Design a protein around this ligand. Structure first.
Ligand SMILES: Nc1nc2c(ncn2[C@@H]2O[C@H](COP(=O)(O)OP(=O)(O)O)[C@@H](O)[C@H]2O)c(=O)[nH]1
Lengths: 38, 431, 155, 27
């Protein structure tokens, strides 16, 4: 049951990479955090 | 009835394929219309191996003609035997491969491959008992090399239990100045090592040297080169086309010739060597036949057989001759030249005799050797490949087709591994 | 007839046969089936002495074949630096264009011969010259050649 | 043995589609 659920979620991932590849056919990353108290 | 499906790809593949059909048609008594006009029953006994019997007692080659170059269809149709080929078996593209393996294997070739597979599927299913396939092609261009090896791979998926046999013309800068030919040949060899059961190495380097040095032709033409090719192809296929005991099918030939799966590159040889227009005043004796066919000057691959060892040999003698004299002569070359034959494969030299000789010859002999000296051919290509590859020369023509540089690295490494395997068996002893 | 013999000898590197054919009156600008002269053939095959003899006997240093390639294009493509230097010293056109818009610099860069790219540039080769695919010589060598950042910000 | 051979040949097919898609990215 959990393996079937994971297989389904992993197909969403393959699809997401296809979407990303499709955008590329048509036409590094900063992550901000605040200063700590400490 | 042990049928073979023949496929010819590219300009070289179609040129030597056409000559193959013109030559074996003459031997079997088949004219360009498909009618039989012979004297011997041995001509038609095994005609089924290469020909289909059409309505009206006609014979039609089980041949598929392929090229991305559209102009190739006209030259094939205009040949002496262009009339005999099944019209629907001609599969031609409009845009050539421009001497690019990547175009033939991945792009233009891939656009045309399903049309070819349809026509090979139809010839294959029509067979009572298909043996396998025979592909004529060059490795230096784009269509024969790239699309030919793509065809091999697709055919292997649908017919994995059939023999894949090729007549692969190796490039030489003596006959072609195209800079990328070592790239195309290395990429093709990588495919052949994995996907064929047996490959005849017809080397343009050996063909040019035979024409120039032995036949005394100042500037050998492709016709001169192809006279040797057709004479070889007729000899190496004699056992398959005529009734006999030894190496009568592609599978029994492979069991006799290939002790290790990757080591399936054969060095073909023939005797007597002749040019077009050279008349035979007298027939060679059995000792002259035996001596000449084993000579390095008679090999169709530019390798010295005395720089390696013979894993296996198939000798075919054609014409009417003493079998006792043939046996004596075959035992004589093995006992006198014992150091060029592996001692751990007992009785590795098999000899067949066919009563029917080739055109213009009363006696002839064909040699097929699986020799560790074939590494000289692979080392020569590898060296040319490496000279350009280290400079990353002309790669954009290949990577521009979607190819990865890593494929070149993989092909180079595989061919270099093949060379090390031949050297390993050359140095092996019967402990 | 002597033109065919001169082309075979230029390709085959027969230095003495070329010298004999030249003395017997062979045409220096005889063409093969592709429009290549003996100079193109000696340039492809790398026979420096044959190139020097052909030039000394009046060969056209900028002769073009049916593809628009000069002996300089082919010397560059086949990586023969000394031949490139001899051709250049004998008036070869550094900005010669073939059917694809390739100049000798384009072919030297494709061939991976940086030493030829240099001598062409010192003889005036145009670095901005584009082929019919919109590519410069260095674009070809580049084509041949093949993460997250955490930033703490005060508020 | 035949299934292993087919799996290997089918991976060549997946690769060929990747090559075809890579060309598309360029032009
Ligand atoms: N022996 C022989 N070699 C050939 C012939 N035609 C082309 N070649 C060689 O094949 C290579 C070029 O491949 P080619 O068959 O012309 O290209 P393709 O049409 O793209 O497959 C070069 O090494 C040529 O010297 C031929 O009729 N006979």
């Amino acid at each position: 049951h959990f393996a079937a659920m994971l297989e389904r979620l992993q197909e969403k991932d393959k699809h997401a990479e296809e979407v990303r590849k499709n955008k590329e056919l048509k036409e590094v990353q900063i992550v901000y955090k605040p200063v700590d108290l400490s | 009835m042990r049928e073979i499906v023949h496929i010819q790809a590219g300009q070289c593949g179609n040129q030597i394929g056409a000559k193959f059909w013109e030559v074996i048609s003459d031997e079997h008594g088949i004219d360009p219309t498909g009618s039989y006009h012979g004297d011997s029953d041995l001509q038609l006994e095994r005609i089924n191996v290469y020909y289909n019997e059409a309505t009206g007692n006609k014979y039609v080659p089980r041949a598929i003609l392929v090229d991305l170059e559209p102009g190739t269809m006209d030259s094939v149709r205009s040949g002496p035997f262009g009339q005999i080929f099944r019209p629907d078996n001609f599969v031609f593209g409009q845009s050539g491969a421009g001497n690019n393996w990547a175009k033939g294997h991945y792009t233009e070739g891939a656009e045309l491959v399903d049309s070819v597979l349809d026509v090979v599927r139809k010839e294959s299913e029509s067979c009572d008992c298909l043996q396998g396939f025979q592909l004529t092609h060059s490795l230096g261009g784009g269509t024969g090399s790239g699309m030919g090896t793509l065809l091999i791979s697709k055919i292997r998926e649908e017919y994995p239990d059939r023999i894949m046999n090729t007549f692969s013309v190796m490039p030489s800068p003596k006959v072609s100045d195209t800079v990328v030919e070592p790239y195309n040949a290395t990429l093709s060899v990588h495919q052949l090592v994995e996907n064929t059961d047996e490959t005849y190495c017809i080397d343009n380097e050996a063909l040019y040297d035979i024409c120039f040095r032995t036949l005394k032709l100042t500037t050998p033409t492709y016709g001169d080169l192809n006279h040797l090719v057709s004479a070889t192809m007729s000899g190496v296929t004699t056992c398959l086309r005529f009734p006999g005991q030894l190496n009568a099918d592609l599978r029994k030939l492979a069991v006799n010739m290939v002790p290790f799966p990757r080591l399936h590159f054969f060095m073909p040889g023939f005797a007597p060597l002749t040019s077009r227009g050279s008349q035979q005043y007298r027939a060679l004796t059995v000792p002259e036949l035996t001596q000449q066919m084993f000579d390095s000057k008679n090999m169709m691959a530019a390798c010295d057989p005395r720089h390696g060892r013979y894993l296996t040999v198939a000798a075919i003698f054609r014409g009417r001759m003493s079998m006792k004299e043939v046996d004596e002569q075959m035992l004589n070359v093995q006992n006198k030249n014992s150091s060029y034959f592996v001692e751990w494969i007992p009785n590795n030299v098999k000899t067949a005799v066919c009563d029917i000789p080739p055109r213009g010859l009363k006696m002839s002999a064909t040699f097929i050797g699986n020799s560790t000296a074939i590494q000289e051919l692979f080392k020569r290509i590898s060296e040319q490949f490496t000279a350009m590859f280290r400079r990353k020369a002309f790669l954009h023509w290949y990577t521009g087709e979607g190819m990865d540089e890593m494929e070149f690295t993989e092909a180079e490494s595989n061919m270099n591994d093949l060379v090390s395997e031949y050297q390993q068996y050359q140095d092996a002893t019967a402990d | 007839d002597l033109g065919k013999k001169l082309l075979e000898a230029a390709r085959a590197g027969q230095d003495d046969e070329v010298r004999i054919l030249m003395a017997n009156g062979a045409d220096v600008n005889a063409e093969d089936d592709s429009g290549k002269t003996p100079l193109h053939l000696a340039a492809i095959k790398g026979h420096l002495e044959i190139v020097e003899v052909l030039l000394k006997h009046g060969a056209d240093v900028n002769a073009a074949d049916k593809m628009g390639d000069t002996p300089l294009h082919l010397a560059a493509l086949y990586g023969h630096l000394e031949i490139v230097e001899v051709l250049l010293k004998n008036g070869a056109d550094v900005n010669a264009t073939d059917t694809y818009g390739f100049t000798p610099l384009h072919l030297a860069a494709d061939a991976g011969h940086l030493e030829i790219v240099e001598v062409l540039l010192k003889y005036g080769a145009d670095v901005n010259a584009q082929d019919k695919f919109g590519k410069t010589a260095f674009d070809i060598s580049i084509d041949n050649g093949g993460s997250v950042q955490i930033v703490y910000k005060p508020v």
